[PDB]
Amino acid sequence: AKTLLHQYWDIPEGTECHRKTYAATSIGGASGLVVSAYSVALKTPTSFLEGVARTGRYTFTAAAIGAIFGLTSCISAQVREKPDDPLNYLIGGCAGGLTLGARTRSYGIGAAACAYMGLTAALVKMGQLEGWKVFAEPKV
């Protein structure tokens, strides 16, 4: 939601750490709720306990992506000491992609997820930094 993404972008990046990781786990909980809701809505799990297992798997993967991504975000920003580069989040997106691939227990999914999640996280910080408007103007 607007509230938790605003909590995530409230903190300077910057070193006010592990609030970033908790907000990213909230991102993971929301994403897992979305995917799990549609997945149990469009499967007929047969039976409900296996549906609980599927929902738990998706939420655990999304929360793990959020947690690992927030940790590497904060750590890379503390080490490189430059709170304006997108390259630290490039490294963060690749790390999140590799851990997604490892929890799905593969190699190629992990490498392609590294590449695409890194480039998209770079685009996220790059647009938040230079200034690209969220979802509308809506003016002309």
Partner 1 sequence: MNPIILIIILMTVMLGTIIVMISTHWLLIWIGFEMNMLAIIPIMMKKHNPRATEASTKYFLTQSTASMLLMMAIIINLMFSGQWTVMKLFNPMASMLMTMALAMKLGMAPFHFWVPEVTQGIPLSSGLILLTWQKLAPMSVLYQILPSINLDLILTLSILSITIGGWGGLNQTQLRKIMAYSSIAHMGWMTAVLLYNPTMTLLNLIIYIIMTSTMFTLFMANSTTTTLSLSHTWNKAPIMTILVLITLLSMGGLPPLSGFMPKWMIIQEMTKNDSIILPTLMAITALLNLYFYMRLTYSTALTMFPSTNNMKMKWQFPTTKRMTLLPTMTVLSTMLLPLTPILSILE
Q: Which residue has the tokens 């994403």?
A: 31
**Cβ closer to partner 1: 36 or 99?**
36
**Cβ closer to partner 1: 75 or 126?**
126
Tell which residue, 17, 27, 114, 111, has the closest CA to residue 71. 17
**Cβ closer to partner 1: 42 or 49?**
42
Note the residues at the interface with partner 1 (CB under 8 A). 127, 132-133, 135-140
Using CA atoms, how far residue 92 sits from 6, 21, 97, 108, 111, in Å, is 20, 12, 9, 18, 13
**Cβ closer to partner 1: 48 or 135?**
135
Task: Enumerate helices (H) and strands (E) in the chain, giving the number of each.
Answer: 5, 0
Rounded least distance, CB 124 to partner 1, Å: 11
**Structure tokens that stand for 64 in this block:** 């793990």
Rounded least distance, CB 42 to partner 1, Å: 9
Rounded least distance, CB 106 to partner 1, Å: 22
